[PDB]
Amino acid sequence: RFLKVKNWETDVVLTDTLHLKSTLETGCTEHICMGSIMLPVRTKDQLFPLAKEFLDQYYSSIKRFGSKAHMDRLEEVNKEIESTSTYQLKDTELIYGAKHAWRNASRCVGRIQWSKLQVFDARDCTTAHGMFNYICNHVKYATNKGNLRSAITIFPQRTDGKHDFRVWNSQLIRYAGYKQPDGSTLGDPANVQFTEICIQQGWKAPRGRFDVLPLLLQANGNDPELFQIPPELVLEVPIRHPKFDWFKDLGLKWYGLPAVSNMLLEIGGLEFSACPFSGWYMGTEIGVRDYCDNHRYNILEEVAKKMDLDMRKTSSLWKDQALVEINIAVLYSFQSDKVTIVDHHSATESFIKHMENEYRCRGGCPADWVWIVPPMSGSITPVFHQEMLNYRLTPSFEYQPDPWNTHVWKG
Amino acid sequence: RFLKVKNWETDVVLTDTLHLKSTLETGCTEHICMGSIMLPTKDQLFPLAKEFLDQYYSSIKRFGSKAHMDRLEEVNKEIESTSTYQLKDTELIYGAKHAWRNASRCVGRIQWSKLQVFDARDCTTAHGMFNYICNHVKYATNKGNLRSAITIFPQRTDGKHDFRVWNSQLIRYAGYKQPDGSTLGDPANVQFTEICIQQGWKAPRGRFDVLPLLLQANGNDPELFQIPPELVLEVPIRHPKFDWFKDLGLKWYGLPAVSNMLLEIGGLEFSACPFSGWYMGTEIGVRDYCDNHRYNILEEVAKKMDLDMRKTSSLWKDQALVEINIAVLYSFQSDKVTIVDHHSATESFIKHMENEYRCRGGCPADWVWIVPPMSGSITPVFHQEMLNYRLTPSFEYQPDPWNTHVW
Ligand code: HEM
Ligand code: HEM
Numbered sequence: 001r002f003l004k005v006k007n008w009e010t011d012v013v014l015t016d017t018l019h020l021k022s023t024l025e026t027g028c029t030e031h032i033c034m035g036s037i038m039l040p041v042r043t044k045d046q047l048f049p050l051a052k053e054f055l056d057q058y059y060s061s062i063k064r065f066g067s068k069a070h071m072d073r074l075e076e077v078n079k080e081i082e083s084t085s086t087y088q089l090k091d092t093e094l095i096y097g098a099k100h101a102w103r104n105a106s107r108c109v110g111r112i113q114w115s116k117l118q119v120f121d122a123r124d125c126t127t128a129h130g131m132f133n134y135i136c137n138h139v140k141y142a143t144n145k146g147n148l149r150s151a152i153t154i155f156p157q158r159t160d161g162k163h164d165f166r167v168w169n170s171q172l173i174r175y176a177g178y179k180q181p182d183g184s185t186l187g188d189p190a191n192v193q194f195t196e197i198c199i200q201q202g203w204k205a206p207r208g209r210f211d212v213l214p215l216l217l218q219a220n221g222n223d224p225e226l227f228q229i230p231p232e233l234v235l236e237v238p239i240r241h242p243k244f245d246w247f248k249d250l251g252l253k254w255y256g257l258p259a260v261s262n263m264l265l266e267i268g269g270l271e272f273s274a275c276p277f278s279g280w281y282m283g284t285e286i287g288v289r290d291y292c293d294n295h296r297y298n299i300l301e302e303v304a305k306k307m308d309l310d311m312r313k314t315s316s317l318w319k320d321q322a323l324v325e326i327n328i329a330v331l332y333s334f335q336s337d338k339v340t341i342v343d344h345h346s347a348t349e350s351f352i353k354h355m356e357n358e359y360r361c362r363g364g365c366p367a368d369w370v371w372i373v374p375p376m377s378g379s380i381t382p383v384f385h386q387e388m389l390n391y392r393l394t395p396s397f398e399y400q401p402d403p404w405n406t407h408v409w410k411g
Numbered sequence: 412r413f414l415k416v417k418n419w420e421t422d423v424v425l426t427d428t429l430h431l432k433s434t435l436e437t438g439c440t441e442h443i444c445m446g447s448i449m450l451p452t453k454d455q456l457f458p459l460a461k462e463f464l465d466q467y468y469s470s471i472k473r474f475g476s477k478a479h480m481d482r483l484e485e486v487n488k489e490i491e492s493t494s495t496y497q498l499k500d501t502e503l504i505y506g507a508k509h510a511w512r513n514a515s516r517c518v519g520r521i522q523w524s525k526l527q528v529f530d531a532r533d534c535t536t537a538h539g540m541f542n543y544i545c546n547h548v549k550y551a552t553n554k555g556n557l558r559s560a561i562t563i564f565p566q567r568t569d570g571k572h573d574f575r576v577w578n579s580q581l582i583r584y585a586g587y588k589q590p591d592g593s594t595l596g597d598p599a600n601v602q603f604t605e606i607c608i609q610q611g612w613k614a615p616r617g618r619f620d621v622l623p624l625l626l627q628a629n630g631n632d633p634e635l636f637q638i639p640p641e642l643v644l645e646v647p648i649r650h651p652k653f654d655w656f657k658d659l660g661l662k663w664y665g666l667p668a669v670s671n672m673l674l675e676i677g678g679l680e681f682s683a684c685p686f687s688g689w690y691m692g693t694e695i696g697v698r699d700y701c702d703n704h705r706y707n708i709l710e711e712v713a714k715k716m717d718l719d720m721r722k723t724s725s726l727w728k729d730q731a732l733v734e735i736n737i738a739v740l741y742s743f744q745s746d747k748v749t750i751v752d753h754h755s756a757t758e759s760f761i762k763h764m765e766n767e768y769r770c771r772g773g774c775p776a777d778w779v780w781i782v783p784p785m786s787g788s789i790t791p792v793f794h795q796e797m798l799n800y801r802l803t804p805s806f807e808y809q810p811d812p813w814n815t816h817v818w
């Protein structure tokens with residue numbers, strides 16, 4: 001099968017053949033599209049084909065397909081699986097696999113960068129204290145005094161599912177949220193449940209609007225343990241506006257390092273349940289989502305009020321006007337402080353260049369339009385008019401249940 | 412068999428059961444989602460007729476009644492004998508309203524039941540088609556107090572006597588390739604304009620020339636007609652704060668009337684079925700004005716605003732976009748021409764969708780089209796999970812007639 005995608009702005013038509021390598025399910029069928037649904041132990045028998053498929057891909061990529069080295073490796077893994085029910089990745093394979101999981105991440109507009117990922121191998125880690133040290137090192141490396149560098153840290157793979165490594169935080173750095181008796185929220189509403197867990201576990205909460213959460217870390221299936229990230233390692237940016245001098249008195253700031261820590265990395269059938277990865281922000285993630293979602297910091301009203309916009313009717317577009325000014329502020333603040341950030345025009349322009357290159361060299365670039373098109377000004381970015389095909393390639397990043405839902409407490 | 416949709420803003424969860432009535436294909440498979448692809452005989456007719464008549468008789472609470480059974484037989488008899496059948500006026504009206512109700516890409520469906528249906532199945536000639544369309548335009552426009560309407564010409568027979576409106580919308584602007592290399596007018600309409608010229612239209616060659624209608628009756632060669640200029644309501648675009656905005660010489664038409672789609676009811680195919688509503692402001696200010704392959708005015712507006720256009724990160728494009736969209740809404744409002752802003756329309760759609768889940772068991776919706784082309788996240792549809800599926804009666808795409816027509 002050849003599948004065509006068209007760009008409705010340029011009339012450029014591309015041909016996808018990479019979809020023939022797709023594996024897992026999309027959730028969709030011939031009768032129902034689930035394109036806007038956010039979320040729609042392995043046996044020996046299941047594991048060897050998965051491992052073989054991965055190794056064949058790896059050895060093709062190094063131009064050693066069918067070599068003695070390739071064949072010896074398949075045999076070595078086969079024997080390892082039959083006698084241990086699992087296998088260990090070589091470091092080169094782990095690097096390749098992590099980079100490919102990013103390259104395959106259909107919801108990621110930042111993939112032009114995929115080949116420049118620093119992979120920290122933490123598979124020798126045994127304890128939560130060990131995890132804490134690895135994570136601090138990751139943060140320091142990735143932050144790089146504001147010249148941000150993409151990185152992933154990979155903890156030991158799942159064995160029987162009773163010994164999982166997990167970062168209980170959804171991101172390495174994120175702000176606490178506190179539900180008040182009057183039903184209001186102090187700080188970030190997205191993190192209320194996790195904040196309550198930290199407090200229950202012993203965290204002394206400062207109870208302010210931007211308190212950096214402690215890490216809650218589980219090694220080897222043990223109960224998780226609390227650790228404070230050294231404050232000097234957490235780079236933050238006070239938010240101001242280039243023309244509006246009152247913007248700073250909103251008291252806004254954000255952290256520089258976006259670091260997703262709640263996803264599962266699948267490579268050759270192996271499951272890495274603790275694999276925090278980080279890049280740098282696109283400005284709308286902070287300006288649109290984190291600041292202006294109604295269930296997040298929800299600042300639109302306050303900003304528009306200070307701007308003295310006509311808020312009597314939605315048709316003045318007061319909400320849209322304020323939204324643009326906040327996003328200006330986020331970009332201005334990061335740039336002024338020399339902390340890496342990308343605006344949504346630059347990011348989507350680079351994505352389309354990446355995507356076209358992927359079509360030429362790889363036969364495709366799976367992409368989820370719902371996530372790729374930015375949450376403001378969609379139509380004026382080059383991804384809006386670009387048709388995309390969404391499908392699942394491995395290696396991959398996957399969602400997993402929050403661990404407090406599944407953890408067996410030891411006491 | 413029961414599907415859940417979640418709202419990520421409210422945590423509200425809804426259950427869809429209506430998808431089990433879906434019939435046509437989505438284009439997606441278990442392996443690949445085509446959600447962002449824009450276009451992904453006698454034996455066949457009776458089940459479709461039956462499927463439709465069953466839904467109709469259920470709708471008026473007479474399912475399994477003698478009148479239901481008698482109508483089913485009547486239609487069976489008619490297909491057996493004539494190879495087709497004719498809808499009762501009641502069925503035609505129900506079918507057209509439901510094709511709108513079922514349009515998963517339309518944010519405006521809260522209004523679905525208020526549609527005015529003009530039955531033009533007695534039309535036989537292109538000149539007749541022209542008369543029906545002027546009447547639709549005048550009725551729908553209603554001096555700026557716009558009213559939804561559809562006009563339904565005769566159904567397809569053997570497929571070589573199709574009624575077609577060759578225009579993509581009843582009202583749209585000409586586009587002309589220039590010796591310059593640039594485009595004058597609307598680049599979306601370049602090809603259709605050339606066909607009109609080929610067919611003999613005296614083109615004014617200006618920036619906002621309302622295209623003539625090119626109408627095909629009974630599979631005959633299409634004919635050219637000019638909509639009475641006094642029936643085409645237009646709005647000059649100005650800004651409530653920027654006095655220079657009017658200098659750009661911008662205007663748009665008040666009536667959005669899609670005229671290139673096909674209406675399927677009970678297996679019958681209505682290849683000419685122009686329908687109209689009123690505009691959501693982003694359709695003119697974001698798509699028509701700011702797409703690069705449309706009027707592409709972002710740069711000129713930003714220049715007049717004196718924005719820093721050195722770097723994308725100043726968000727000059729976003730700034731000019733908002734101002735253009737303010738000016739569209741202001742202009743329509745000031746001239747008392749119905750228009751809806753994207754916050755109001757999406758709020759109404761969420762209210763409609765909840766109604767539909769509770770009274771109908773679901774509401775097929777295509778997030779890619781339902782989320783407005785600017786400020787997506789700050790509208791209540793962004794955080795709303797949707798299920799997209801195809802119910803009939805339906806509006807469908809069909810190929811442009813110049814690729815098909817035998818002259
Ligand atoms: C280098 C700079 C990066 C940028 C600018 C970037 C940008 C983004 C954005 C904007 C989204 C979601 C759309 C939105 O939030 O509006 C996203 C999603 C995602 N990205 Fe990236 N990304 C970057 C690096 C990375 C890295 C290093 C990885 C992993 C190695 C990664 C993997 C993912 C994944 C798996 C998702 C989907 C998350 C989910 O489903 O919840 N990205 N990216
Ligand atoms: C009454 C006011 C109406 C409003 C505000 C409205 C709004 C819209 C919008 C905004 C879109 C496309 C998304 C976009 O342009 O950003 C759309 C698509 C559509 N609407 Fe409506 N609509 C209205 C009335 C109607 C009527 C009366 C019908 C048919 C009887 C209809 C059927 C459709 C169909 C079939 C599409 C998909 C068109 C395509 O695939 O190109 N709508 N609507």
Ligand SMILES: Cc1cc(N)nc(CCc2cc(N)cc(CCc3cc(C)cc(N)n3)c2)c1
Nearest residue numbers: 038258260277278279280281282370371419794
């Ligand atoms: C490594 C990395 C770097 C970087 N800069 N950004 C990311 C993505 C982080 C992310 C985090 C959260 N909490 C939510 C979303 C979108 C949540 C969302 C999106 C859409 C389109 C709909 C919906 N309901 N929710 C994205 C990862």
Ligand SMILES: Cc1cc(N)nc(CCc2cc(N)cc(CCc3cc(C)cc(N)n3)c2)c1
Nearest residue numbers: 008385449667669686687688689690691779780
């Ligand atoms: C009856 C009626 C009333 C009313 N107010 N609006 C309409 C819709 C008219 C319409 C017309 C055109 N040419 C394009 C689009 C979106 C084209 C589009 C959308 C998306 C999301 C992507 C893409 N490539 N193209 C919509 C109909």
Ligand SMILES: OC[C@@H](O)[C@@H](O)[C@H](O)[C@H](O)CO
Nearest residue numbers: 170190191192193194262402
């Ligand atoms: O407070 C808990 C939440 O932060 C958490 O459940 C996230 O929503 C989840 O991990 C998805 O990112």
Ligand SMILES: [Cl-]
Nearest residue numbers: 258285286290
């Ligand atoms: Cl974030």
Ligand SMILES: [Cl-]
Nearest residue numbers: 289293419794
């Ligand atoms: Cl979100």
Ligand SMILES: [Cl-]
Nearest residue numbers: 667694695699
């Ligand atoms: Cl339009």
Ligand SMILES: [Cl-]
Nearest residue numbers: 008385698702
């Ligand atoms: Cl468009």
Ligand SMILES: [Zn+2]
Nearest residue numbers: 028033439444
């Ligand atoms: Zn799909």
Ligand SMILES: [Zn+2]
Nearest residue numbers: 289293788794
């Ligand atoms: Zn959001």
Ligand SMILES: [Zn+2]
Nearest residue numbers: 379385698702
């Ligand atoms: Zn467009």
